[PDB]
């Protein structure tokens, strides 16, 4: 089974969160498994929303119970969270617990809560000099300027190199904006032929940037 | 908080460590405990059900026990990728699933000096009116490193933000960025712009500095 979570990155305060989960591979008609709803607030623990089970029975976070509808479809099911403040802003998971230890999660999809304005990133690259290199090993990178809100998704030539790519946590600015740079070392006998793309991704702007790093 | 974990806890590689779960009556020793496995980036995963039961995909490496109203999650032969956040979990009687606050697991490798590399401001930034250099610290362990920004050979101090990533799967190292920010303006009145870096994988501290416009 696959689960695949749904949803806005932003929304505003007092507003209902929708999010739902695209379940593949598997129905949601077949105890015994728990169809759960799961967050995380950022760079922190874990917290259980709730469960959801095939024949519709659910089972509440008591702290969140007065504020929580999870329901099934005629193959997803949904989170609904009313009235949502900053105390909200976390990543929600949907997951699949298996009473007999088969149990998937999905990706997670973050969820910030806030009345600020979009804004999308500037992006800038750290060119690879002789001050970026050492031993044969070349540093580059991109600079992901001033958006918001988290997050933004950093690829190097379409996904295709993951060895030595670091990408930091974001920082939040005076601005009040987030900047993030993502760095990778290279080989420095490559800096001449081979291409290097910076793929920026940010949704809640819609910002698809692909810099050539020279 | 419901269920009580160290923060943190570490090994070195193919050593072992135990990880404790504290509950109550009404969770742990009423029920069940299971361990989740989070790597950095990744949605947590189930590691250990029903006290000890390994699901599929997961080496015997780790195992886990419960008495009475305490749990404990062992993991004998320590790799790099062991590196995680581990939460132990249990339904409570009245208030549901609840979960432990979490344990960073950290691996005791061998200490590496961090590669030093700077970044000055692009062109295509300094349009904007603004000026970020990029000092990158790379791949060192353990975890404490200090940053020093100089101007024209003077400390700098307030202007500059730094983050650092989480513990990498493959080599058990760890990565600083430093990031200062100066108005264009600012940039411009100055000649050298230097990275002074700290480390107990350095004999003496690291400078990586450039003069505006060179390479
Ligand atoms: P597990 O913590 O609890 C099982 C026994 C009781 C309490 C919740 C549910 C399942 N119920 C029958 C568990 C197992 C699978 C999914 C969620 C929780």
């Known amino acids: 089974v696959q689960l695949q979570e749904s949803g806005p990155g932003l929304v505003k305060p007092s507003q209902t969160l929708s999010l739902t989960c695209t379940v593949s591979?598997?129905?949601?008609?077949?105890?015994?498994?728990?169809w759960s709803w799961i967050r995380q607030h950022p760079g922190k623990g874990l917290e259980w929303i709730g469960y959801?089970?095939?024949?519709?029975?659910?089972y509440y976070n008591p702290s969140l119970k007065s504020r929580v509808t999870i329901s099934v479809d005629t193959n997803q099911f949904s989170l609904k969270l009313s009235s949502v403040t900053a105390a909200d802003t976390a990543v929600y998971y949907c997951?699949?617990?298996?009473?007999?230890?088969?149990?998937?999660w999905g990706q997670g999809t973050l969820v910030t809560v806030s009345s600020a304005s979009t804004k999308g990133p500037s992006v800038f690259p750290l060119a690879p000099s002789s001050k970026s290199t050492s031993g044969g090993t070349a540093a580059l990178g991109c600079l992901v300027k001033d958006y918001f809100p988290e997050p933004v998704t950093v690829s190097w030539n379409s996904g295709a190199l993951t060895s030595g790519v670091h990408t930091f946590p974001a920082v939040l600015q005076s601005s009040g904006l987030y900047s993030l740079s993502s760095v990778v070392t290279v080989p420095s006998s490559s800096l001449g032929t081979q291409t290097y793309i910076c793929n920026v991704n940010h949704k809640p702007s819609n910002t698809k940037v692909d810099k050539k790093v020279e | 908080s419901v269920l009580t974990q160290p923060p943190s806890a570490s090994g070195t590689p193919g050593q072992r460590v135990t990880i404790s779960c504290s509950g109550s009556?009404?969770?742990?020793?009423?029920?069940?405990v299971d361990w989740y496995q989070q790597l950095p980036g990744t949605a947590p995963k189930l590691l250990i059900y029903?006290?000890?039961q390994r699901p599929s995909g997961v080496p015997d490496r780790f195992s886990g026990s419960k008495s009475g109203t305490s749990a404990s999650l062992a993991i004998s032969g320590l790799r790099s990728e062991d590196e995680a956040d581990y939460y132990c979990?249990?339904?409570?009687?009245?208030?549901?699933?609840?979960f432990g606050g979490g344990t960073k697991l950290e691996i005791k490798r061998t200490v590496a000096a961090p590669s030093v590399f700077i970044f000055p401001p692009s062109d295509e930034q300094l349009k904007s009116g603004t000026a970020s250099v990029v000092c990158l610290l790379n791949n060192f362990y353990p975890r404490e490193a200090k940053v020093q920004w100089k101007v024209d050979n003077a400390l700098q101090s307030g202007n500059s933000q730094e983050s650092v990533t989480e513990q990498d799967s493959k080599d058990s190292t760890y990565s600083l960025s430093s990031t200062l920010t100066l108005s264009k303006a600012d940039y411009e009145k100055h000649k050298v712009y230097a990275c002074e870096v700290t480390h107990q994988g350095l004999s003496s501290p690291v400078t990586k500095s450039f003069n505006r416009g060179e390479c």
């Open positions: 009556s009404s969770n742990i020793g009423s029920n069940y």
């Open positions: 979990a249990a339904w409570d009687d009245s208030l549901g699933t609840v």
């Open positions: 959801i089970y095939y024949s519709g029975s659910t």
């Open positions: 029903r006290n000890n």
């Open positions: 591979g598997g129905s949601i008609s077949s105890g015994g498994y728990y």
């Open positions: 997951a699949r617990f298996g009473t007999r230890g088969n149990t998937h």
